[PDB]
Write a protein that binds this ligand. Structure first.
Ligand SMILES: COC(=O)c1cccc([C@@H]2C[C@@H](O)N3c4cc(C)c(C)cc4N(C[C@H](O)[C@H](O)[C@H](O)COP(=O)(O)OP(=O)(O)OC[C@H]4O[C@@H](n5cnc6c(N)ncnc65)[C@H](O)[C@@H]4O)C4=NC(=O)NC(=O)[C@@]423)c1
Lengths: 133, 666
C-alpha cells in the first residue's frame, strides 16, 4: 500500500521528473535557485533587523517614571472632581485611565461617579464632545 | 521441514497439494475424492523420502512397495504408477547411482544431444537410463560448458560456476551426496575498502547498505503500486527506476530545506514588523516624556487644568511603557524561537560523493548477481524467480566444480571437438551436420529421431548464425531469443606463494572511483585451500575489460591489492588466468537475465519443442523432433547450474514420454 518510510514517491512527482530527458535536472535546478533566493532574503532581513535592533539601544529605562503606591480613598474633593470631568473629556468611557489619572478613585467609583454627579457636572455633554474627536 | 513432508520440500513440491504436472498424469486422482488424493500424496512423499535418504543406489518399484505400509501399499498399481512418474521426471534415480537392474541390452530410439554442459549431461544420463541410444556433440575439448575449472599444480579455481546457492530444496544437494564434493560454507562478512586503500567505517557501511535495500524496495513500489512500467513507449528498466527514485529523494531533501528556511524568513519578518513597531513606540515615548517634563516645570500651585496635564501625561506615558514592555517580552520569544530553528537544520545532502560511491558498490553487486548492467534488467520482472530461492548457506566447491560434470559424463558417448554447424529436422527424423574444431574440413553427419539442443542462449543469439536450423526456427521461438537477455561477467584468478589477506574472511570488496567502473575488479574471493584470490568483473566493466591484455588486468588487481595490504605484502602472482566469456564462441556470454521488455514467460517459450511440417502434404501431423534445454529454458531457476540440470531432467522426461510412451497415465 505504502512506500518504505522516508522515501517520497507521489504520483504527481514521478511524472514531473520523467516528462523529458533533463526534466529531472531542471526541477532540481529550480529548487537550488529557489533556495539561494530565500537564503539571501534571510541575510537581508537579518541585517535590516540588525539596524532596527540597534536604534532601540538602552530601551526606555531613561524615560520611565516611578510607581505611585497610593492607598485608595473614598471621598471626592473638588480637586479630584475637577480632574475627573477633564479626564472624561479626554478618555471618553475608558474608566481605567480615569482611575489612573485621579489616582485615588477605583473604576467602580469612577463609574459610580458617572451617576452621582451626572447632572451637576453635565457629564452628558462632556461625553458627547469626546465622541466629536 | 522434516518427515515425508521434508522430502516434498527438498523436491520443490507442495506436500499437501498436487502439482499441475501431476494433474496431467493422474487426472483420475485429482478429479476424484479428496481421500485418494491424500493417499497419492503420501505415496509420492514416501517414495521421494526413500530416494533422498539414500541416493547412492537405484530405488526400484519393488524396494518402494516393500517399505510402504498399509493401507498405502494396498493398491500396487497406484504405487507402481506413482513410482514410474517419479522415475521418468527425474525426481528419483537421477544423477550417479548404482543400478540394481542393469540396462536393457537393446536400445530404443536414437537422440542427438547438442552440448555437454550440465543440462546436456543430465538429459544424456536420464535418456541412457531409460534405454535410449544417446550421443552428445561438444564443440569444446572438455565437458562442463560454463562449469569450467582451472587446474595446475595444487591450484584449483573455477572460472565459471563457483557457488551452490543453498541446499534447501536444491537438486545439487542430492548430487553432492553422490560425488565427492568438498562443500565449504561461505562466511557472509564482507569488508569494503575505498579506492584510497582503507576500510569503510562500520557506521558508514550500514547506512549505505540499508539505503541500498531501501532503494530496491522503492523501485518495487513504483513497479507494483504506481504501474511505472512504460516510458516513451519503452519498457522501464531497473536502472531507470533507481535513478528516478534517487532523484526523488534528492528532490525531497531540497523541498525540505526550502520549507525550513521559509520558516525562518516568516519568523524574521514577524520580528521585522515588531521591531518597527517598537522603534515607533520608543519615539512617542521620547516626546511624551519631554512633554511631561515640561509640564512638571510649571511649579505649583497650579490651576486644575495644569495639574490635569501632569497627571494625564503621566498616565499616558505609563500606558505606552506598559505596551513597550509587552513587545519586549514578545520580542524575546521570537529571538529565542529563531535560535531553535537555526539550530535544528535538516540534512544538506541526500548522499555525499563518498556515500554515493559506496552505494555504487552495492549496485555492482546486483550487476554481478544478474550479470548485466541494471539499465538492461526489466523493472517489473528482473526478480521474478525470488520465490523459489533455496534455504541455507551458500557454499563453494573447494575441489573444483568441474568434478560434477566430469562425474556425470562417466558412461556416455561424447564426441569432443565436434562443432554442430547445422540442424535438419523433418517429419521422419533429424540429421545434425558437425565439423571438427581442430580441422574444419572434416565433416560429420548424425541421423537421429530427436535432437536435444542445449546451445547457450548467446550462441542461439549469434548473428550471423553459428548454427543453422533447417527449416528455420519459427518466429515465436526466434523472438523469445531476441527478447531475452544474455549477460556477462568475468573472473581474474590470482595465484600466489603465500596468504597475505585475512584468512577468516572469504570475500572483500573494493570501492570504485566512478560510477562507470563500479564493476571493475569490485570484489575478491578467498575460497580455496591453496593461496588463490579471485576477482570479479561485473556490470559494464565486464564487456570492456575483455579488450585489455591479461597483464594490464593483473596489474590493476595488484595495485588494488597493494592499496589494501601495503606494497611489501603483495608478491607477484605465480599463475594468472582471465576469463573472457563474451568472446568465448561456445558461450557468447555468461548467463541469462530477464531483459527489460522480456518476462519469465519467454523462458517457457524457450522450452517448447519444435514439431516439423509433414513431408507429404495431407500426411498426419508429426511428432516433435527438436527439444531445448539449458539454463535459459527453466523459468523458475534460470542462470544457475541447478536450473540447467533441472531442465536436462525435464527434457529427458518429455522425450522419453514421446518416444517410449508413458504407461503411468492410464
Ligand atoms: C538469479 O540467479 C543467478 O543468476 C545466480 C544465482 C547464484 C549464483 C550464480 C552464479 C554466478 C556465478 O558465480 N556463477 C557463474 C559464473 C560464470 C562466470 C558463469 C559463466 C556462469 C555461472 N553460473 C551459471 C552456470 O554456470 C550455467 O548457467 C550453467 O552451467 C549452464 O549450463 P548449460 O545450460 O548446460 O550450458 P553450457 O553452456 O554449460 O553447456 C553448453 C554446451 O554447448 C556447447 N556448445 C556451444 N556451441 C556448440 C556448438 N556449435 N556445437 C557443439 N557444442 C556447442 C558448449 O561447448 C557447452 O559444452 C552460475 N550458476 C551457478 O549456479 N553458480 C554460480 O556460481 C554462478 C547465478
Amino acid at each position: 500500500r505504502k512506500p518504505p518510510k522516508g522515501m517520497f514517491l507521489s504520483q504527481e512527482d514521478v511524472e514531473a521528473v520523467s516528462a523529458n530527458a533533463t526534466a529531472a535536472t531542471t526541477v532540481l535546478r529550480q529548487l537550488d535557485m529557489e533556495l539561494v533566493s530565500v537564503k539571501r532574503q534571510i541575510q537581508n532581513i537579518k541585517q535590516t533587523n540588525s539596524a532596527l535592533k540597534e536604534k532601540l539601544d538602552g530601551g526606555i529605562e531613561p524615560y520611565r517614571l516611578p510607581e505611585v503606591i497610593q492607598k485608595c480613598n473614598a471621598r471626592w474633593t473638588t480637586e479630584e472632581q475637577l480632574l475627573a470631568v477633564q479626564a472624561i473629556r479626554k478618555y471618553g468611557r475608558d474608566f481605567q485611565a480615569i482611575s489612573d489619572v485621579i489616582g485615588n478613585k477605583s473604576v467602580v467609583q469612577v463609574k459610580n461617579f458617572f451617576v452621582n454627579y451626572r447632572r451637576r457636572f453635565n457629564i452628558d455633554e462632556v461625553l458627547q464632545e469626546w465622541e466629536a474627536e | 521441514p522434516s518427515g515425508v513432508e521434508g522430502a516434498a520440500f527438498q523436491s520443490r513440491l507442495p506436500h499437501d497439494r498436487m502439482t499441475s504436472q501431476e494433474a496431467a498424469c493422474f487426472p483420475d486422482i485429482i478429479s476424484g475424492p479428496q481421500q485418494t488424493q491424500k493417499v497419492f500424496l503420501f505415496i509420492r512423499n514416501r517414495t521421494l523420502q526413500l530416494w533422498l535418504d539414500n541416493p547412492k543406489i537405484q530405488l526400484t518399484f519393488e524396494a518402494t512397495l516393500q517399505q510402504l505400509e498399509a493401507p498405502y501399499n494396498s493398491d500396487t498399481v497406484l504405487v507402481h504408477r506413482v513410482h514410474s512418474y517419479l522415475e521418468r521426471h527425474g525426481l528419483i534415480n537421477f544423477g550417479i547411482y548404482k543400478r540394481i537392474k542393469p540396462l536393457p541390452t537393446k536400445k530404443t530410439g536414437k537422440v542427438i544431444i547438442i552440448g555437454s554442459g550440465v543440462s546436456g549431461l543430465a538429459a544424456a544420463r536420464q535418456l541412457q537410463s531409460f534405454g535410449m541410444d544417446v550421443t552428445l556433440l561438444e564443440a569444446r575439448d572438455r565437458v562442463g560448458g560454463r562449469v569450467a575449472t582451472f587446474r595446475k599444480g595444487n591450484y584449483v579455481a573455477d572460472l565459471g560456476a563457483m557457488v551452490v546457492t543453498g541446499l534447501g530444496g536444491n537438486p545439487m544437494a542430492v548430487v553432492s551426496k553422490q560425488v565427492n564434493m568438498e562443500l565449504a560454507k561461505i562466511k557472509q562478512k564482507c569488508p569494503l575498502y575505498e579506492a584510497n586503500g582503507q576500510a569503510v567505517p562500520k557506521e558508514k557501511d550500514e547506512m549505505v547498505e540499508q539505503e541500498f535495500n531501501r532503494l530496491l524496495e522503492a523501485t518495487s513500489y513504483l513497479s507494483h503500486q504506481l504501474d511505472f512500467n512504460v516510458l516513451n513507449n519503452k519498457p522501464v528498466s531497473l536502472g531507470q527506476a533507481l535513478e528516478v527514485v534517487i532523484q526523488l529523494q534528492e528532490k525531497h531533501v531540497k523541498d525540505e530545506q526550502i520549507e525550513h528556511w521559509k520558516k525562518i524568513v516568516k519568523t524574521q519578518e514577524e520580528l521585522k514588523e515588531l521591531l518597527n513597531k517598537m522603534v515607533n513606540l520608543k519615539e512617542k515615548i521620547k516626546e511624551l516624556h519631554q512633554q511631561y517634563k515640561e509640564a512638571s516645570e510649571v511649579k505649583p500651585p497650579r490651576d486644575i487644568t495644569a495639574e490635569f496635564l501632569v497627571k494625564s501625561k503621566h498616565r499616558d506615558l505609563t500606558a505606552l511603557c506598559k505596551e513597550y514592555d509587552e513587545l519586549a517580552e514578545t520580542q524575546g520569544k521570537l529571538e529565542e524561537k529563531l535560535q531553535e530553528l537555526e539550530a535544528n537544520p535538516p540534512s544538506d545532502v541526500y548522499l555525499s560523493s563518498r556515500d554515493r560511491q559506496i552505494l555504487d558498490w552495492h549496485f555492482a553487486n546486483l550487476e554481478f548477481a544478474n550479470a548485466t548492467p541494471l539499465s538492461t534488467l526489466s523493472l517489473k520482472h528482473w526478480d521474478q524467480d525470488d520465490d523459489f530461492e533455496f534455504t541455507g548457506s551458500h557454499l563453494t566447491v573447494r575441489n573444483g566444480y568441474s568434478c560434477v560434470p566430469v562425474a556425470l559424463a562417466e558412461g556416455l558417448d561424447i564426441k569432443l571437438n565436434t562443432a554442430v554447424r547445422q540442424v535438419r529436422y523433418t517429419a521422419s527424423g533429424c540429421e545434425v551436420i558437425a565439423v571438427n574444431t581442430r580441422s574444419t574440413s572434416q565433416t560429420f553427419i548424425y541421423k537421429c529421431d530427436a535432437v536435444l539442443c542445449t546451445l547457450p542462449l548467446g550462441v542461439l543469439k549469434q548473428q550471423p548464425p553459428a548454427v543453422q536450423f533447417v527449416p528455420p526456427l519459427p518466429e515465436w521461438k526466434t523472438s523469445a531469443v531476441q527478447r531475452m537477455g544474455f549477460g556477462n561477467l568475468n573472473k581474474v584468478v590470482l595465484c600466489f606463494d603465500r596468504v597475505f589477506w585475512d584468512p577468516s574472511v572469504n570475500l572483500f570488496g573494493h570501492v570504485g572511483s566512478t560510477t562507470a567502473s563500479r564493476g571493475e575488479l569490485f570484489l575478491f574471493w578467498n575460497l580455496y585451500k591453496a593461496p588463490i584470490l579471485l576477482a570479479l568483473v561485473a556490470g559494464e566493466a565486464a564487456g570492456i575489460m575483455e579488450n585489455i591484455s591479461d597483464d594490464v588486468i593483473v596489474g590493476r588487481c595488484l595495485a588494488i591489492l597493494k592499496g589494501i595490504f601495503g606494497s611489501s605484502a603483495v608478491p607477484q602472482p605465480k599463475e594468472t588466468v582471465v576469463s573472457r566469456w563474451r568472446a568465448d564462441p561456445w558461450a557468447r556470454g555468461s548467463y541469462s537475465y530477464v531483459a527489460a521488455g522480456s518476462s519469465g514467460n519467454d523462458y517457457d517459450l524457450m522450452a517448447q519443442p519444435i514439431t516439423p511440417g509433414p513431408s507429404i502434404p495431407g500426411a498426419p501431423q508429426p511428432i516433435p523432433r527438436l527439444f531445448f534445454a539449458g539454463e535459459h529454458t527453466i523459468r523458475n531457476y534460470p542462470a544457475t547450474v541447478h536450473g540447467a540440470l533441472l531442465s536436462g531432467l525435464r527434457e529427458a522426461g518429455r522425450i522419453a514420454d514421446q518416444f517410449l510412451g508413458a504407461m503411468y497415465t492410464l
